[PDB]
Structure formats: structure tokens, C-alpha cells
């Protein structure tokens, strides 16, 4: 079906800035497009309907323009409540698609993550499972990539990660990634590595350990 691509997917800014988010459709949607702002823990809120009409009760710093395949939302003077995720929605064709969203967060200086790797506890191992956790602490911007390697084999499909919300004092994020293996598989290898790529790191940093080394 019809594709709606938002740009950028993520954007950093400060109070008082002017930002503009754009949304492009794969086929023309005339003026049937709406913009929403969604704050964490709340439902999306309508800002602009029919590509450019200002929704009632919505502050005038919000503006929408465009028609056909290209639309833009601009917030002229960013206020603290605007740090949030924005979505565009097309209503010309069924299904009524939403774009992928664009996260707007507090800008601050680039900060590389402090990385730490934790081997599984002997207590967990006795239960038959092995969790290897990697921590990326206080970094910025939000995008980071974690790659698990076991005896140099690239791992896939056996890890999960979660990211904290932007810290209200730091403006940094932290990320936890868990590699999970059976105790048996765990025992069949030695070098457990967490490879981290991030804008603040000149090149990828790797933190690792050799299993059973005492």
C-alpha cells in the first residue's frame, strides 16, 4: 500500500528553535493529511487537519503546509511541551496510514557512551540459563548500535534491548542490551563481546570477557 515517510526520524533542538518536520507520500493524497503531537504516556493530539488548517485550541506556533506528496509541519518557536514525537496521517486512501514518527528531543553536546559488559551470575547459570548484559551509559544522540559477538560469531535474534527516556538533567540516554543463551551453549564458547557504534566514538568500542577465566 501507500507509504508515508517522515523526515527526519529523530531531531534535536532547544527551546526557542524553529523546526520543521516533513512527510512524503508514495502517491498523492491531495490535502487529506493530519499532523499530531504525542507526549510520552499520552494519546496523540491533533495539531493540523486537512494539511494546513489549524485545529481549534492549538497554539499558533504550529503550522502546516503542502499538498499532493509532500507536507511539512513547522513549529516556529519550540516550547518545552514540544519535546515529543510527531506523526503525520494520510486520510485519502484506505487504510488511513500513519508515518513512522519523528522524535524531537533536547539538544546537548555529543557524548559517547560509557560501556560495560556483565557476565552471567553463577546463580543464574545453576538454573540453566545465561544472560549477558551490555550497558551503554549516558550517551547522546540517541542512536546507538550494539552488536554481540561470541568467539567472533556475529549474534542475531538472541538479544533484546531497551532505552531510558531522555534524562531531565543530563539530556543523555542509556541503553541496556541482554544476550540470552542456554547454559549449555554458553559453556561452548569463550569470548563474549559487546561491540558499540555511536556518533561520539571515533571508531567502535568493544568490551568483552573470556568465560570461566578466574
Amino acid at each position: 500500500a501507500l507509504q508515508l515517510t517522515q523526515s527526519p526520524s529523530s531531531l534535536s533542538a532547544s527551546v526557542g528553535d524553529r523546526i520543521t518536520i516533513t512527510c512524503r507520500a508514495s502517491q498523492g493524497v491531495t490535502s487529506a493529511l493530519a499532523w499530531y503531537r504525542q507526549k510520552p504516556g499520552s494519546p496523540p493530539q491533533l495539531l493540523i487537519y486537512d494539511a494546513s488548517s489549524l485545529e481549534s485550541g492549538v497554539p499558533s506556533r504550529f503550522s502546516g503546509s503542502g499538498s499532493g506528496t509532500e507536507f511539512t509541519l513547522t513549529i516556529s518557536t519550540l516550547r518545552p511541551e514540544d519535546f515529543a514525537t510527531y506523526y503525520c496521517q494520510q486520510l485519502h486512501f484506505y487504510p488511513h496510514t500513519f508515518g513512522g514518527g519523528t522524535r524531537v528531543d533536547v539538544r546537548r553536546t555529543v557524548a559517547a557512551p560509557s560501556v560495560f559488559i556483565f557476565p552471567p551470575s553463577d546463580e543464574q547459570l545453576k538454573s540453566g540459563t545465561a544472560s549477558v548484559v551490555c550497558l551503554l551509559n549516558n550517551f547522546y544522540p540517541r542512536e546507538a548500535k550494539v552488536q554481540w559477538k561470541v568467539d567472533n560469531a556475529l549474534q542475531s535474534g538472541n538479544s533484546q534491548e531497551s532505552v531510558t527516556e531522555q534524562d531531565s538533567k543530563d539530556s543523555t540516554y542509556s541503553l541496556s542490551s541482554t544476550l540470552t543463551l542456554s547454559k549449555a551453549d554458553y559453556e561452548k564458547h569463550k569470548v563474549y563481546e559487546c561491540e558499540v557504534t555511536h556518533q561520539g566514538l571515533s571508531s567502535p568500542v568493544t568490551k568483552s570477557f573470556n568465560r570461566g577465566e578466574c
Binding site: 494519546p43 491533533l46 486537512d50 488548517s53 496521517q89
Partner: peptide, 29 residues
Amino acid sequence: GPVNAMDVWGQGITVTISSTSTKGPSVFP
């Protein structure tokens, strides 16, 4: 023009799909 948006939303209801029964965590260091 006013039909081009969903103008009012409900708070949302969180639904979890799992075959799990209630269970306490194991805590590891």
C-alpha cells in the same frame, strides 16, 4: 476539510498478550 484528521482521542487501553500466569522475578547480580 474537517474530515481529514481523527480530532479527539481516548486515553488508550494497554493490552498484553501472553499465555503467562502470574509469576515473581528471579533477581541476579
